JSON list of C-alpha atoms in Angstrom, two decimals:
[
{"chain": "G", "resi": 1, "resn": "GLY", "atom": "CA", "xyz": [-25.62, 49.14, -75.43]},
{"chain": "G", "resi": 2, "resn": "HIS", "atom": "CA", "xyz": [-29.27, 50.22, -75.10]},
{"chain": "G", "resi": 3, "resn": "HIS", "atom": "CA", "xyz": [-30.84, 46.73, -74.62]},
{"chain": "G", "resi": 4, "resn": "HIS", "atom": "CA", "xyz": [-28.78, 45.54, -71.62]},
{"chain": "G", "resi": 5, "resn": "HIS", "atom": "CA", "xyz": [-28.67, 49.17, -70.34]},
{"chain": "G", "resi": 6, "resn": "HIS", "atom": "CA", "xyz": [-32.42, 49.74, -70.28]},
{"chain": "G", "resi": 7, "resn": "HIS", "atom": "CA", "xyz": [-33.02, 46.21, -68.91]},
{"chain": "G", "resi": 8, "resn": "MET", "atom": "CA", "xyz": [-30.52, 46.62, -66.02]},
{"chain": "G", "resi": 9, "resn": "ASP", "atom": "CA", "xyz": [-32.32, 49.96, -65.31]},
{"chain": "G", "resi": 10, "resn": "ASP", "atom": "CA", "xyz": [-35.72, 48.22, -65.34]},
{"chain": "G", "resi": 11, "resn": "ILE", "atom": "CA", "xyz": [-34.55, 45.45, -62.97]},
{"chain": "G", "resi": 12, "resn": "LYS", "atom": "CA", "xyz": [-33.24, 48.07, -60.56]},
{"chain": "G", "resi": 13, "resn": "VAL", "atom": "CA", "xyz": [-36.54, 50.01, -60.42]},
{"chain": "G", "resi": 14, "resn": "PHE", "atom": "CA", "xyz": [-38.49, 46.76, -60.27]},
{"chain": "G", "resi": 15, "resn": "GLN", "atom": "CA", "xyz": [-36.39, 45.59, -57.31]},
{"chain": "G", "resi": 16, "resn": "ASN", "atom": "CA", "xyz": [-36.97, 48.91, -55.53]},
{"chain": "G", "resi": 17, "resn": "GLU", "atom": "CA", "xyz": [-40.76, 48.42, -55.95]},
{"chain": "G", "resi": 18, "resn": "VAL", "atom": "CA", "xyz": [-40.54, 44.81, -54.65]},
{"chain": "G", "resi": 19, "resn": "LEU", "atom": "CA", "xyz": [-38.79, 46.27, -51.55]},
{"chain": "G", "resi": 20, "resn": "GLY", "atom": "CA", "xyz": [-41.52, 48.97, -51.13]},
{"chain": "G", "resi": 21, "resn": "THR", "atom": "CA", "xyz": [-44.20, 46.23, -51.40]},
{"chain": "G", "resi": 22, "resn": "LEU", "atom": "CA", "xyz": [-42.52, 44.07, -48.77]},
{"chain": "G", "resi": 23, "resn": "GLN", "atom": "CA", "xyz": [-41.83, 46.99, -46.38]},
{"chain": "G", "resi": 24, "resn": "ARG", "atom": "CA", "xyz": [-45.59, 47.65, -46.56]},
{"chain": "G", "resi": 25, "resn": "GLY", "atom": "CA", "xyz": [-46.28, 43.95, -46.24]},
{"chain": "G", "resi": 26, "resn": "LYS", "atom": "CA", "xyz": [-44.25, 43.66, -43.09]},
{"chain": "G", "resi": 27, "resn": "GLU", "atom": "CA", "xyz": [-45.79, 46.82, -41.51]},
{"chain": "G", "resi": 28, "resn": "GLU", "atom": "CA", "xyz": [-49.40, 45.82, -42.44]},
{"chain": "G", "resi": 29, "resn": "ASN", "atom": "CA", "xyz": [-49.19, 42.06, -42.56]},
{"chain": "G", "resi": 30, "resn": "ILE", "atom": "CA", "xyz": [-50.47, 42.19, -46.18]},
{"chain": "G", "resi": 31, "resn": "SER", "atom": "CA", "xyz": [-51.61, 38.70, -47.24]},
{"chain": "G", "resi": 32, "resn": "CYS", "atom": "CA", "xyz": [-49.46, 36.52, -49.44]},
{"chain": "G", "resi": 33, "resn": "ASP", "atom": "CA", "xyz": [-52.21, 36.61, -52.12]},
{"chain": "G", "resi": 34, "resn": "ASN", "atom": "CA", "xyz": [-52.16, 40.44, -52.25]},
{"chain": "G", "resi": 35, "resn": "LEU", "atom": "CA", "xyz": [-48.37, 40.50, -52.28]},
{"chain": "G", "resi": 36, "resn": "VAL", "atom": "CA", "xyz": [-48.41, 38.16, -55.27]},
{"chain": "G", "resi": 37, "resn": "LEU", "atom": "CA", "xyz": [-50.95, 40.42, -57.12]},
{"chain": "G", "resi": 38, "resn": "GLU", "atom": "CA", "xyz": [-48.62, 43.45, -56.48]},
{"chain": "G", "resi": 39, "resn": "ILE", "atom": "CA", "xyz": [-45.44, 41.63, -57.61]},
{"chain": "G", "resi": 40, "resn": "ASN", "atom": "CA", "xyz": [-47.27, 40.32, -60.70]},
{"chain": "G", "resi": 41, "resn": "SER", "atom": "CA", "xyz": [-48.41, 43.80, -61.73]},
{"chain": "G", "resi": 42, "resn": "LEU", "atom": "CA", "xyz": [-44.84, 45.20, -61.21]},
{"chain": "G", "resi": 43, "resn": "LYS", "atom": "CA", "xyz": [-43.35, 42.35, -63.32]},
{"chain": "G", "resi": 44, "resn": "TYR", "atom": "CA", "xyz": [-45.53, 43.52, -66.22]},
{"chain": "G", "resi": 45, "resn": "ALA", "atom": "CA", "xyz": [-45.09, 47.22, -65.42]},
{"chain": "G", "resi": 46, "resn": "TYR", "atom": "CA", "xyz": [-41.34, 46.95, -65.42]},
{"chain": "G", "resi": 47, "resn": "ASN", "atom": "CA", "xyz": [-41.12, 44.23, -68.18]},
{"chain": "G", "resi": 48, "resn": "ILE", "atom": "CA", "xyz": [-39.06, 41.80, -66.19]},
{"chain": "G", "resi": 49, "resn": "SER", "atom": "CA", "xyz": [-38.95, 38.07, -66.88]},
{"chain": "G", "resi": 50, "resn": "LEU", "atom": "CA", "xyz": [-40.61, 35.45, -64.54]},
{"chain": "G", "resi": 51, "resn": "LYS", "atom": "CA", "xyz": [-37.12, 34.16, -63.65]},
{"chain": "G", "resi": 52, "resn": "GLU", "atom": "CA", "xyz": [-36.07, 37.73, -62.77]},
{"chain": "G", "resi": 53, "resn": "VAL", "atom": "CA", "xyz": [-39.10, 37.93, -60.41]},
{"chain": "G", "resi": 54, "resn": "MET", "atom": "CA", "xyz": [-37.77, 34.84, -58.52]},
{"chain": "G", "resi": 55, "resn": "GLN", "atom": "CA", "xyz": [-34.17, 36.13, -58.36]},
{"chain": "G", "resi": 56, "resn": "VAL", "atom": "CA", "xyz": [-35.26, 39.64, -57.30]},
{"chain": "G", "resi": 57, "resn": "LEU", "atom": "CA", "xyz": [-37.71, 38.34, -54.66]},
{"chain": "G", "resi": 58, "resn": "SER", "atom": "CA", "xyz": [-34.84, 36.14, -53.27]},
{"chain": "G", "resi": 59, "resn": "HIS", "atom": "CA", "xyz": [-32.37, 39.06, -53.13]},
{"chain": "G", "resi": 60, "resn": "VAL", "atom": "CA", "xyz": [-34.88, 41.49, -51.63]},
{"chain": "G", "resi": 61, "resn": "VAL", "atom": "CA", "xyz": [-35.95, 39.13, -48.81]},
{"chain": "G", "resi": 62, "resn": "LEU", "atom": "CA", "xyz": [-32.31, 38.13, -48.05]},
{"chain": "G", "resi": 63, "resn": "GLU", "atom": "CA", "xyz": [-31.25, 41.84, -48.03]},
{"chain": "G", "resi": 64, "resn": "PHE", "atom": "CA", "xyz": [-34.29, 42.98, -46.06]},
{"chain": "G", "resi": 65, "resn": "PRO", "atom": "CA", "xyz": [-32.67, 42.46, -42.57]},
{"chain": "G", "resi": 66, "resn": "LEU", "atom": "CA", "xyz": [-29.70, 44.70, -43.44]},
{"chain": "G", "resi": 67, "resn": "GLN", "atom": "CA", "xyz": [-32.05, 47.75, -43.14]},
{"chain": "G", "resi": 68, "resn": "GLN", "atom": "CA", "xyz": [-32.51, 46.56, -39.54]},
{"chain": "G", "resi": 69, "resn": "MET", "atom": "CA", "xyz": [-28.94, 46.27, -38.30]},
{"chain": "G", "resi": 70, "resn": "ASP", "atom": "CA", "xyz": [-25.70, 48.16, -38.04]},
{"chain": "G", "resi": 71, "resn": "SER", "atom": "CA", "xyz": [-22.29, 47.14, -39.36]},
{"chain": "G", "resi": 72, "resn": "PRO", "atom": "CA", "xyz": [-20.02, 45.19, -38.76]},
{"chain": "G", "resi": 73, "resn": "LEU", "atom": "CA", "xyz": [-22.63, 42.68, -40.02]},
{"chain": "G", "resi": 74, "resn": "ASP", "atom": "CA", "xyz": [-23.41, 40.24, -37.25]},
{"chain": "G", "resi": 75, "resn": "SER", "atom": "CA", "xyz": [-24.75, 36.85, -38.29]},
{"chain": "G", "resi": 76, "resn": "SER", "atom": "CA", "xyz": [-26.84, 35.58, -35.39]},
{"chain": "G", "resi": 77, "resn": "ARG", "atom": "CA", "xyz": [-28.54, 38.94, -35.42]},
{"chain": "G", "resi": 78, "resn": "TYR", "atom": "CA", "xyz": [-29.10, 38.45, -39.18]},
{"chain": "G", "resi": 79, "resn": "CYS", "atom": "CA", "xyz": [-30.61, 34.95, -38.76]},
{"chain": "G", "resi": 80, "resn": "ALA", "atom": "CA", "xyz": [-32.89, 36.09, -35.99]},
{"chain": "G", "resi": 81, "resn": "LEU", "atom": "CA", "xyz": [-34.28, 38.87, -38.28]},
{"chain": "G", "resi": 82, "resn": "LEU", "atom": "CA", "xyz": [-34.40, 36.76, -41.43]},
{"chain": "G", "resi": 83, "resn": "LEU", "atom": "CA", "xyz": [-36.33, 33.74, -40.16]},
{"chain": "G", "resi": 84, "resn": "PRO", "atom": "CA", "xyz": [-39.62, 35.59, -39.27]},
{"chain": "G", "resi": 85, "resn": "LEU", "atom": "CA", "xyz": [-39.56, 36.97, -42.85]},
{"chain": "G", "resi": 86, "resn": "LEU", "atom": "CA", "xyz": [-39.13, 33.56, -44.50]},
{"chain": "G", "resi": 87, "resn": "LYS", "atom": "CA", "xyz": [-42.01, 32.22, -42.40]},
{"chain": "G", "resi": 88, "resn": "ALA", "atom": "CA", "xyz": [-44.22, 35.15, -43.28]},
{"chain": "G", "resi": 89, "resn": "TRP", "atom": "CA", "xyz": [-43.50, 35.15, -47.03]},
{"chain": "G", "resi": 90, "resn": "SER", "atom": "CA", "xyz": [-42.82, 31.48, -47.81]},
{"chain": "G", "resi": 91, "resn": "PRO", "atom": "CA", "xyz": [-46.07, 31.31, -49.81]},
{"chain": "G", "resi": 92, "resn": "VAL", "atom": "CA", "xyz": [-44.86, 34.24, -51.98]},
{"chain": "G", "resi": 93, "resn": "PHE", "atom": "CA", "xyz": [-41.70, 32.13, -52.77]},
{"chain": "G", "resi": 94, "resn": "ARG", "atom": "CA", "xyz": [-43.82, 29.02, -53.55]},
{"chain": "G", "resi": 95, "resn": "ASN", "atom": "CA", "xyz": [-46.09, 30.92, -55.97]},
{"chain": "G", "resi": 96, "resn": "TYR", "atom": "CA", "xyz": [-43.14, 31.31, -58.39]},
{"chain": "G", "resi": 97, "resn": "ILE", "atom": "CA", "xyz": [-40.70, 28.52, -57.38]},
{"chain": "G", "resi": 98, "resn": "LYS", "atom": "CA", "xyz": [-42.24, 25.36, -58.74]},
{"chain": "G", "resi": 99, "resn": "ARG", "atom": "CA", "xyz": [-39.96, 23.28, -61.00]},
{"chain": "G", "resi": 100, "resn": "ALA", "atom": "CA", "xyz": [-36.41, 21.96, -60.40]},
{"chain": "G", "resi": 101, "resn": "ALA", "atom": "CA", "xyz": [-34.98, 24.72, -62.61]},
{"chain": "G", "resi": 102, "resn": "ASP", "atom": "CA", "xyz": [-36.78, 27.35, -60.49]},
{"chain": "G", "resi": 103, "resn": "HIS", "atom": "CA", "xyz": [-35.43, 25.87, -57.28]},
{"chain": "G", "resi": 104, "resn": "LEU", "atom": "CA", "xyz": [-31.85, 26.20, -58.79]},
{"chain": "G", "resi": 105, "resn": "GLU", "atom": "CA", "xyz": [-32.52, 29.80, -59.81]},
{"chain": "G", "resi": 106, "resn": "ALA", "atom": "CA", "xyz": [-33.39, 30.66, -56.25]},
{"chain": "G", "resi": 107, "resn": "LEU", "atom": "CA", "xyz": [-30.39, 28.70, -54.85]},
{"chain": "G", "resi": 108, "resn": "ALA", "atom": "CA", "xyz": [-28.11, 30.64, -57.15]},
{"chain": "G", "resi": 109, "resn": "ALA", "atom": "CA", "xyz": [-29.53, 33.92, -55.95]},
{"chain": "G", "resi": 110, "resn": "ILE", "atom": "CA", "xyz": [-29.02, 32.70, -52.35]},
{"chain": "G", "resi": 111, "resn": "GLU", "atom": "CA", "xyz": [-25.43, 31.76, -53.27]},
{"chain": "G", "resi": 112, "resn": "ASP", "atom": "CA", "xyz": [-24.77, 35.22, -54.81]},
{"chain": "G", "resi": 113, "resn": "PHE", "atom": "CA", "xyz": [-26.15, 36.88, -51.66]},
{"chain": "G", "resi": 114, "resn": "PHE", "atom": "CA", "xyz": [-23.88, 34.90, -49.35]},
{"chain": "G", "resi": 115, "resn": "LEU", "atom": "CA", "xyz": [-20.81, 35.45, -51.63]},
{"chain": "G", "resi": 116, "resn": "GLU", "atom": "CA", "xyz": [-21.55, 39.17, -51.56]},
{"chain": "G", "resi": 117, "resn": "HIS", "atom": "CA", "xyz": [-21.99, 39.26, -47.74]},
{"chain": "G", "resi": 118, "resn": "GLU", "atom": "CA", "xyz": [-18.98, 37.14, -46.60]},
{"chain": "G", "resi": 119, "resn": "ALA", "atom": "CA", "xyz": [-19.56, 37.94, -42.88]},
{"chain": "G", "resi": 120, "resn": "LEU", "atom": "CA", "xyz": [-23.02, 36.22, -43.03]},
{"chain": "G", "resi": 121, "resn": "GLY", "atom": "CA", "xyz": [-21.57, 32.95, -44.62]},
{"chain": "G", "resi": 122, "resn": "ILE", "atom": "CA", "xyz": [-21.54, 31.25, -41.21]},
{"chain": "G", "resi": 123, "resn": "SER", "atom": "CA", "xyz": [-25.37, 31.39, -41.16]},
{"chain": "G", "resi": 124, "resn": "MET", "atom": "CA", "xyz": [-25.83, 29.88, -44.62]},
{"chain": "G", "resi": 125, "resn": "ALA", "atom": "CA", "xyz": [-26.55, 26.34, -43.28]},
{"chain": "G", "resi": 126, "resn": "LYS", "atom": "CA", "xyz": [-29.32, 27.65, -40.99]},
{"chain": "G", "resi": 127, "resn": "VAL", "atom": "CA", "xyz": [-30.80, 29.67, -43.86]},
{"chain": "G", "resi": 128, "resn": "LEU", "atom": "CA", "xyz": [-30.93, 26.67, -46.26]},
{"chain": "G", "resi": 129, "resn": "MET", "atom": "CA", "xyz": [-32.61, 24.61, -43.44]},
{"chain": "G", "resi": 130, "resn": "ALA", "atom": "CA", "xyz": [-35.31, 27.30, -43.18]},
{"chain": "G", "resi": 131, "resn": "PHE", "atom": "CA", "xyz": [-35.87, 27.28, -46.97]},
{"chain": "G", "resi": 132, "resn": "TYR", "atom": "CA", "xyz": [-35.99, 23.48, -46.77]},
{"chain": "G", "resi": 133, "resn": "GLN", "atom": "CA", "xyz": [-38.32, 23.12, -43.77]},
{"chain": "G", "resi": 134, "resn": "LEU", "atom": "CA", "xyz": [-40.62, 25.84, -45.19]},
{"chain": "G", "resi": 135, "resn": "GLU", "atom": "CA", "xyz": [-40.77, 23.79, -48.43]},
{"chain": "G", "resi": 136, "resn": "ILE", "atom": "CA", "xyz": [-39.50, 26.65, -50.55]},
{"chain": "G", "resi": 137, "resn": "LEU", "atom": "CA", "xyz": [-36.59, 24.46, -51.71]},
{"chain": "G", "resi": 138, "resn": "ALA", "atom": "CA", "xyz": [-36.55, 20.67, -52.32]},
{"chain": "G", "resi": 139, "resn": "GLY", "atom": "CA", "xyz": [-33.73, 18.65, -50.69]},
{"chain": "G", "resi": 140, "resn": "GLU", "atom": "CA", "xyz": [-32.70, 17.14, -54.04]},
{"chain": "G", "resi": 141, "resn": "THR", "atom": "CA", "xyz": [-32.12, 20.55, -55.72]},
{"chain": "G", "resi": 142, "resn": "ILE", "atom": "CA", "xyz": [-30.19, 21.75, -52.64]},
{"chain": "G", "resi": 143, "resn": "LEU", "atom": "CA", "xyz": [-27.87, 18.68, -53.14]},
{"chain": "G", "resi": 144, "resn": "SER", "atom": "CA", "xyz": [-27.66, 19.27, -56.90]},
{"chain": "G", "resi": 145, "resn": "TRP", "atom": "CA", "xyz": [-26.71, 22.91, -56.29]},
{"chain": "G", "resi": 146, "resn": "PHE", "atom": "CA", "xyz": [-24.06, 21.97, -53.70]},
{"chain": "G", "resi": 147, "resn": "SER", "atom": "CA", "xyz": [-22.44, 19.60, -56.23]},
{"chain": "G", "resi": 148, "resn": "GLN", "atom": "CA", "xyz": [-22.16, 22.06, -59.20]},
{"chain": "G", "resi": 149, "resn": "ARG", "atom": "CA", "xyz": [-19.34, 23.01, -61.69]},
{"chain": "G", "resi": 150, "resn": "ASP", "atom": "CA", "xyz": [-19.08, 26.86, -61.12]},
{"chain": "G", "resi": 153, "resn": "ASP", "atom": "CA", "xyz": [-13.92, 30.27, -57.58]},
{"chain": "G", "resi": 154, "resn": "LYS", "atom": "CA", "xyz": [-15.36, 31.93, -54.42]},
{"chain": "G", "resi": 155, "resn": "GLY", "atom": "CA", "xyz": [-18.33, 29.57, -54.90]},
{"chain": "G", "resi": 156, "resn": "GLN", "atom": "CA", "xyz": [-16.00, 26.56, -54.69]},
{"chain": "G", "resi": 157, "resn": "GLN", "atom": "CA", "xyz": [-14.51, 28.12, -51.51]},
{"chain": "G", "resi": 158, "resn": "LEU", "atom": "CA", "xyz": [-18.02, 28.58, -50.01]},
{"chain": "G", "resi": 159, "resn": "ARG", "atom": "CA", "xyz": [-18.76, 24.82, -50.49]},
{"chain": "G", "resi": 160, "resn": "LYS", "atom": "CA", "xyz": [-15.92, 24.12, -48.05]},
{"chain": "G", "resi": 161, "resn": "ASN", "atom": "CA", "xyz": [-17.95, 25.81, -45.32]},
{"chain": "G", "resi": 162, "resn": "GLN", "atom": "CA", "xyz": [-18.06, 23.42, -42.36]},
{"chain": "G", "resi": 163, "resn": "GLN", "atom": "CA", "xyz": [-21.56, 23.99, -41.05]},
{"chain": "G", "resi": 164, "resn": "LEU", "atom": "CA", "xyz": [-22.71, 23.65, -44.70]},
{"chain": "G", "resi": 165, "resn": "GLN", "atom": "CA", "xyz": [-20.94, 20.28, -45.37]},
{"chain": "G", "resi": 166, "resn": "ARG", "atom": "CA", "xyz": [-22.53, 19.10, -42.09]},
{"chain": "G", "resi": 167, "resn": "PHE", "atom": "CA", "xyz": [-25.93, 20.25, -43.36]},
{"chain": "G", "resi": 168, "resn": "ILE", "atom": "CA", "xyz": [-25.41, 18.66, -46.83]},
{"chain": "G", "resi": 169, "resn": "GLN", "atom": "CA", "xyz": [-24.77, 15.34, -45.12]},
{"chain": "G", "resi": 170, "resn": "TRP", "atom": "CA", "xyz": [-27.73, 15.69, -42.74]},
{"chain": "G", "resi": 171, "resn": "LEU", "atom": "CA", "xyz": [-29.85, 16.57, -45.75]},
{"chain": "G", "resi": 172, "resn": "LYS", "atom": "CA", "xyz": [-28.78, 13.35, -47.51]},
{"chain": "G", "resi": 173, "resn": "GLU", "atom": "CA", "xyz": [-30.19, 11.41, -44.52]},
{"chain": "G", "resi": 174, "resn": "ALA", "atom": "CA", "xyz": [-33.74, 12.87, -44.44]},
{"chain": "G", "resi": 175, "resn": "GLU", "atom": "CA", "xyz": [-33.95, 12.51, -48.29]},
{"chain": "G", "resi": 176, "resn": "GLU", "atom": "CA", "xyz": [-32.61, 9.04, -49.03]}
]
């Protein structure tokens, strides 16, 4: 109906504007503070929730490198492009991602991205390490997420490099 329809339309335009902001941010090296002012204004302009800001920021940054590479999608090439972006914009992530529930919202967006880009799955352990080392995500929420109830998501959690990382991550934490 009209409510879900108009809202899905809003989120789409909003996400397009978050892309435009980050394209400009990457070209200009716009400060994290000014990026946050832009995303905040768009969140009100497009009437999106604060949780939808976090999910959309996560998708847009994770999708950003795809503009920069051909297909078949090659994962080491992906990681090499992604990591400078996470370093640059980690403060933008930390402006919104603050409480345990927020950390799980972002993890679930990261899950959805990997599940939608099966050929990048291999690099998922290295990407979670970057979110962890950059203090975007807490080790304890990463563990919580890994251990959750909800097909393809259960099949992702039998990724080898990931299990290895989940065990490593249990060492630095406890």
